[PDB]
Amino acid sequence: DIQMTQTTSSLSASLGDRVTISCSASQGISNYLNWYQQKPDGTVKLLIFYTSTLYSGVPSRFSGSGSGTDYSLTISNLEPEDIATYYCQQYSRFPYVFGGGTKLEIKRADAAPTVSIFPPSSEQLTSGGASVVCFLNNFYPKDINVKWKIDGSERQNGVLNSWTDQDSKDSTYSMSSTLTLTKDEYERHNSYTCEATHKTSTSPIVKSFNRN
Amino acid sequence: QIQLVQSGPELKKPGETVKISCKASGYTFTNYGINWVKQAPGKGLKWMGWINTITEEPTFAEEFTGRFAFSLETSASTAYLQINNLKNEDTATYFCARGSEFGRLVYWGQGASVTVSSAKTTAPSVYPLAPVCGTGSSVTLGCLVKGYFPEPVTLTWNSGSLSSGVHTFPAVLQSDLYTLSSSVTVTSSTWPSQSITCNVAHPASSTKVDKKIEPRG
């Protein structure tokens, strides 16, 4: 089997610009390479087959080139519907091997996260549970680090995080950090903070509350 | 008219057997072969192999030999993917794709999800998330969906009438159960002025829950 490696997993670009996605192989596959597109909903469709032959129904702004071991996919006029994950596939010799895949993302102006902290619901406390939820919505870039400090001390374990894909509308990102623990553990302390370390600020954004 | 129809989502314990069908239609079934592609959640596409629709002979990849089998029924124009002695790593979506010339994968199926777990069918615990009594232009509300199995679940705000300013976060696994959360941001002049209800529906356990977000107090 041939190792099909795409050197870039994540790629950012502004709409209208030209983007190029590369694909490398450990062996020469002699122009027997195909490109695929996987939209966010999971659907997969063939774009370019045999290195350059555009498939029936593919926009002319899509193009592929390369020879031997190195190949590339190019989109001239980047459009919002082109935001997807692209895989390269060789078929010189069995078995077929897909590439690592390159995720395409829209570049925009940097935005500070909107941090919101939430106490455990009174309905949940009756069930013995007590989840402390921290929302970090609509920020750019994607890179961001959270820190649950409890009584001034950082809480490492028990943190449940969830990240969204790039927003289809404003191209921003959002994260949901939940401090999952029981009611007994929730009443043992009384200082729940939520530090948000992001590029947009030197000092991190801090939201907190207390069950006083 | 060419389409590949696959079976629905599957729920199996570790060590069990799963069978995935791939109905071919809109063309001559014996003219092309069927490829199988595995994709773990968050991972890339993995070419499992293909099966000749004439000789009924499979061609597997490196790692898919032993517990995997390609099969078909000529009279029903349907290919089959069977995985025996299921493991945790088998949890993925399995696509079927018709094999055309130039080794291309064309007319992909919708994919059949396979979930390998020991967890039982569990209804979610819908919990309203209201901010603290303590200001600003907008106000962000939330809805906690904790400990359900399996996927999926549907969350809408005010019967889907409230779409803007909504972030539904992907379900995350915790002790074999899924936990989901969703945020909604509206103006201060509409909440708590108007009712904001979290509509959570988990069909696997026949659960429908409408949860209004009330002010803390």
**Is A89 in Cβ contact with B105 (below 8 Å)?**
yes
Choose among B106, B181, B216: nearest Cβ to A133. Answer: B181
Full DSSP string of A104-139: EEE----B--EEEEEPPPHHHHTTTEEEEEEEEEEE
User: B30 in helix, strand or coil?
Assistant: helix
Min Cα separation A16/chain B (Å): 26
| Of residues A94, A167, A174, nearest to B59 (C-beta) | A94
Q: Where do the domains of chain A lie, and which CATH numbers do they carry?
A: 1-107 (2.60.40.10), 108-212 (2.60.40.10)
Which residues of chain A does B216 touch, with a Cβ-Cβ cutoff of 8 Å? 119
Minimal-distance CA residue of chain B relative to A127: B125
For residues B94 and A25, the answer to whether their CB atoms sit within 8 Å is no
Is the Cβ of B152 closer than 8 Å to some Cβ of chain A?
Answer: no
> What is the C-alpha separation between B105 and A44, in angstroms, rounded?
9
Inter-residue contact B145 to B153 (CB < 8 Å): yes
Short-list A21, A24, A2, CA closest to A11: A21
Strand order of the β-sheet with A62-67 is A4-5, A19-25, A70-75, A62-67
* Cα dihedral A140, B129, B175, B10 sign: negative
| B167, B185, B212, best to mutate vs chain A, most A CBs in 10 Å | B167
B chain contacts of residue A45, beta-carbon cutoff 8 Å: 108
Cross-chain CB nearest to A46 (options B104, B110, B183):
B104
Closest CA in chain A for residue B173: A160
Instruction: Give phi and psi for B204, each to the nearest 5.
Output: -65, -25
Can you spell out the DSSP letters for B78-123? EEEEEE-S--GGG-EEEEEEEE-GGG-EEEE---EEEEE--PPPB-
Residue A175 vs residues A64, A178, B113: alpha-carbon distances, Å: 36, 10, 26
Q: Identify the residue whose tokens are 């490829």.
A: B35
Q: Please name the residue of chain B whose CA is at the shortest distance from the CA of residue A212.
A: B132
Q: Report how far residue A175's alpha carbon sits from residue A134's, in angstroms, rounded to the nearest whole number.
A: 8
Mind telling me how many Å the CA of A99 is from chain B's nearest CA? Answer: 8
- Residue A133 to residue B129, Cβ atoms within 8 A: yes
Superfamily of domain B120-217: Immunoglobulins (2.60.40.10)
Q: Is A174–B183 a contact, with Cβ atoms under 8 angstroms apart? A: yes
Query: Which residues in chain A have Cβ-Cβ distances shorter than 8 Å to B144?
Result: 121, 124, 131, 133, 178
Q: Which strands, in side-by-side order, build the sheet including A205-209?
A: A153-155, A144-150, A192-198, A205-209
Indicate yes or no: CB of A96 within 8 angstroms of CB of B47: yes
Residues with Cβ within 8 Å of B193's Cβ and at least 6 positions away in sequence, in order, are none
Resolution to one decimal, Å:
2.5
- Residue B204 contacts A, CB cutoff 8 Å: no
Site of tokens 């994950």: A85
User: What stretch(es) of chain B map to CATH 2.60.40.10?
Assistant: 120-217
Q: Evaluate whether A97 touches A108 at the Cβ level (below 8 Å).
A: no
Number of A/B CB contacts below 8 angstroms equals: 131
Q: Would you call A46 and B125 a contact, using CB atoms and an 8 Å cutoff?
A: no
